[PDB]
Paper text:
To aid these processes, cells from across the tree of life use a conserved family of polymer-forming endosomal sorting complex required for transport III (ESCRT-III) proteins that deform, cut, and repair membranes (1–3). The most stripped-down version of the ESCRT-III system is found in Asgard archaea, the closest prokaryotic relatives of eukaryotes, which have as few as two ESCRT-III homologs. We show that Asgard ESCRT-IIIB assembles into parallel arrays on planar membranes to initiate membrane deformation, from where it recruits ESCRT-IIIA to generate composite polymers.
However, after mixing the protein with large unilamellar vesicles (LUVs) containing 40 mol % of the negatively charged lipid 1,2-dioleoyl-sn-glycero-3-phospho-l-serine (DOPS), long filaments were observed by cryo-EM. These filaments have a diameter of ~12 nm and are reminiscent of those formed by eukaryotic B-type ESCRT-III proteins. Filaments were also seen decorating and occasionally interacting with LUVs of various shapes, further suggesting that polymer nucleation is aided by the presence of membranes under these conditions. The polymers are composed of four protofilaments (blue, pink, green, and orange). (C) Top view of a cross section through the filament, highlighting the two protofilament pairs and the interprotofilament interactions through α1 and α4. A comparison with our off-membrane structure revealed a slightly smaller intersubunit distance in the membrane-bound protofilament (~3 nm versus 2.7 nm, respectively). This was accompanied by a change in the angle between helices α3 and α4 (off-membrane: 145°; on-membrane: 116°). Although the precise nature of Asgard cell membranes has yet to be determined, our data reveal a requirement for a critical concentration of ESCRT-IIIB protein to initiate polymer formation on reconstituted membranes. This likely reflects the need to form a stable five-subunit nucleus involving i to i + 4 interactions, which then extends by fast polymerization, as is the case for other cytoskeletal elements like actin.
Author numbering:
A (entry chain A): 4 to 168
B (entry chain A): 4 to 109
C (entry chain A): 56 to 109
Write the structure that this text describes.
């Protein structure tokens, strides 16, 4: 009853926390990228102004900024993967519950009409077809009526055909 | 008597649940396809702009999107198969009852 | 490859069509059995009446 709303609230709060933390990490990555671009432009400017040991310091500063940027980017990616895991687990649980409902419905239907009942019904159909064929063959036998004269006048009717011809 | 309506209601509710879940899965597949098309166009654009390691990242992103799309598609197909099983079982039960009635008459 | 999928889809549709067609034919055969049994019973009753008269 009320527990379902509590579960939904807990999942939403966990997603909110994870997304907020990812927002902080993206903000820090943006700041690091800003600093790295500023540092690259500054290094180019002072190399225009003629200094190279300072340029070594500048490229070292850009390198450490790039390293920190990469680390925060990977942390944000991991948080994204865990958000995806939460969503995938919720969807999978709902799908399994739907499949279980369908399985319950089909199980009740198959209990009502089993395969044994189907084979019994078809056996009854074939047996009644046999019986109806027996009755229908009894009443339609030409030897009862059509063959009145079985006499050997096949020669005689041949002669009458010759007469007509 | 009244149990027949309850059975019909239960079957209809089960079909509604399965179709709703299939609707969510089709929506997710549509979103994945949207992302994959966006990613392909983006990769072509930045290869126009001259980068290839980024293109490796882009094709990896498209590959994982395609994998997720395939998985949700197969799940939707399985849900469709189970809906078909429910419908086939209902039709088969009705057919068997009709055949039994005819057998009783004959 | 999509054409392989399409021909597979058509094949399963054809299989389901054949199955429902055979089920309909069996139902037709049972309807025919009901009609034949009614006609045969009426014919036997008529023959019995004639036999009684003769």
């Amino acid at each position: 009853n009320w527990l379902f709303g509590k579960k939904r609230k807990e999942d939403a709060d966990a997603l909110a926390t994870l997304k907020g933390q990812q927002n902080r990490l993206q903000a820090e990555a943006r700041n690091l990228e800003r600093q790295s671009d500023e540092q690259k432009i500054l290094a180019s400017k002072m190399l225009k102004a003629g200094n190279k040991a300072g340029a070594r310091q500048a490229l070292k500063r850009r390198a450490v900024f790039m390293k920190r940027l990469n680390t925060v980017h990977n942390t944000a990616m991991n948080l994204q993967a865990q958000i995806d895991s939460i969503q995938t687990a919720t969807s999978t649980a709902e799908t399994v519950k739907a499949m279980e409902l369908g399985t319950k419905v089909v199980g009740e239907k198959i209990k009502t009409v089993s395969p044994e009942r189907t084979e019994r019904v078809m056996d009854s159909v074939m047996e009644q077809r046999d019986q109806i064929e027996m009755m229908t063959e009894a009443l339609s036998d030409p030897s009862l009526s059509e063959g009145i004269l079985d006499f050997e006048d096949d020669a005689a009717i041949d002669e009458q055909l010759a007469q007509l011809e």
